[PDB]
Design a protein around this ligand. Structure first.
Ligand code: OLA
Ligand code: OLA
Ligand code: CL
Lengths: 183, 186
């Protein structure tokens, strides 16, 4: 039964949530994932940006990718998306752990760890602004008059599915373009 | 003595080191023109590693080769901080910059607002210019060692930056998707 996924909701909101929850289950999402995510609207879109629901600790990342734990935690701080600053706290999205684990390779090439950590810090800040600009841009395109939660979920998955393949190549090209025009 | 007009107003140790640097840059295919235009010319031989092959195109060439509409192309070039604003047949655009800017169109084709699309470029470019600054200082710090000649630095930056480039692209992509995941869950 869905009802506990629906909770306190009533009226039109509960009816729209029912049809959304129904579509997500067919999408292969669990009751378990829907409870932990409010609103459940973006569950069939987050996997397109690499959130599969898996979480890891800094120590797991360290051992699994063979990187220095302390350096890793500096990078996690510099990105600044999860707090719990405990090496055994399982609070990092898998893809975030793996991304943070790349930083050490720059260090092994002789780059200064302080400076690497600083770059990550400035990049994260610049990208967090672009992210928010990106969010608004996408919403404008998805959000149409009188749309239900399910309409929005379907429209978001379609649009983000088409955008994601382009975003990676683009950001990469934009970085190298800035690096071509240093001085 | 053609090299002489490429040393500028330098003197002493620094003039003779600039001479050795210039002789090597020329061996790399950097033209006297490229050297004169770029001052200090120290990382002219690292430039190709970040996508500058010294080939240039016009906006018309960009619009036709890469598929983009010429009006959008100009807007994106403004947002990025490049050639203030030119003539369609003027061959003043780095080829890789034209490819980069032309990707704007595909986003518009998916039904994204052209104004918002240009806005995102503007905001992204702002963030990345700062990142690029700090990246340069990082790389420079790693190669600079006392007793380093200008040529030593040039060659050391080639060796080092050549190893860094393949890591950078995936790096920045991951750092974008990391922000998108955080914003989505937030
Ligand atoms: C987790 C992210 C770690 C960030 C690591 C820091 C990045 C290293 C910096 C890149 C150095 C390459 C810069 C090359 C300058 C090119 C200038 C030119 O000659 O045109
Ligand atoms: C001039 C060309 C610049 C192109 C910039 C790309 C524009 C990207 C627009 C949005 C893509 C971001 C996708 C994630 C947005 C959040 C979606 C959601 O949570 O509903
Ligand atoms: Cl000089």
């Amino acid at each position: 039964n869905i009802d506990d996924l629906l909770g306190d909701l009533g009226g039109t909101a509960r009816a729209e949530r029912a049809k959304l929850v129904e579509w997500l289950l067919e999408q292969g999402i669990t009751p378990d994932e829907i409870r932990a995510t409010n609103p459940p609207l973006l569950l069939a879109t987050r996997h397109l940006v690499g959130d599969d629901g898996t979480y890891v600790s800094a120590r797991e990342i360290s051992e699994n990718y063979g990187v220095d734990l302390e350096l890793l935690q500096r990078v996690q701080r510099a990105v600044g998306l999860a707090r719990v600053d405990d090496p055994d706290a399982v609070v990092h999205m898998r893809a975030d752990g793996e991304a943070a684990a790349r930083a050490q390779r720059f260090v092994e090439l002789g780059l200064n760890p302080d400076q690497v950590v600083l770059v990550v810090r400035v990049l994260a800040e610049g990208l967090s602004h672009a992210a928010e600009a990106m969010r608004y841009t996408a919403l404008e395109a998805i959000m149409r008059p009188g749309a239900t939660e399910l309409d929005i979920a379907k429209g978001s998955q379609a649009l983000v599915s088409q955008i994601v393949p382009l975003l990676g190549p683009m950001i990469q090209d934009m970085l190298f373009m800035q690096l071509r025009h240093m001085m």
